[PDB]
């Protein structure tokens, strides 16, 4: 569960002006223990034959995922990125993306994060878990 309050427009104002926001990355929503962002796939996004690109799919994922990570510490606290990982399991030729992030589990050095990406049909497009060290800042 959430450590620290937040709002989707002050989430997105962190991420403006970086990756997120040239990748067209928008944190969209939130529940107890989930939260959710979208992507666009256009031009910005896809290989060079019209599919979402699953590099960027992995992107998408590790902003998220670490985006959820920071929000499920403390004070004075925040995470890292370690590694990652993802399968890619069908193309994606239209719409916008949507990944959420779900915890797998928090501990007091290493969070692991797991991440859905799902397409406008809500058809599961990428699955990703991605490892992330929390540090005094």
Avoid: Y
Avoid at 47 to 72: K, R, Y
């Amino acid at each position: 569960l959430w450590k620290k309050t937040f709002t989707l427009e002050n989430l997105n104002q962190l991420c403006s002006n970086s990756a997120v926001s040239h990748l067209g990355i928008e944190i969209s929503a939130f529940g107890e223990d989930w939260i959710e962002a979208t992507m666009p796939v256009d031009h910005r996004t896809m290989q060079p034959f019209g599919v979402l690109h699953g590099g960027v799919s992995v992107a998408l994922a590790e902003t998220i995922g670490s985006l959820a990570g920071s929000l499920c510490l403390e004070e004075g606290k925040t995470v890292v990125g370690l590694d990652i990982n993802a399968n890619h399991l069908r193309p994606v030729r239209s719409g916008k993306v949507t990944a959420r992030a779900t915890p797998i589990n928090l501990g007091r050095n290493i969070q692991v994060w797991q991440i859905d990406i799902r397409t406008e049909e809500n058809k599961l497009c990428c699955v990703s878990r991605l490892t992330l060290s929390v540090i005094n800042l």
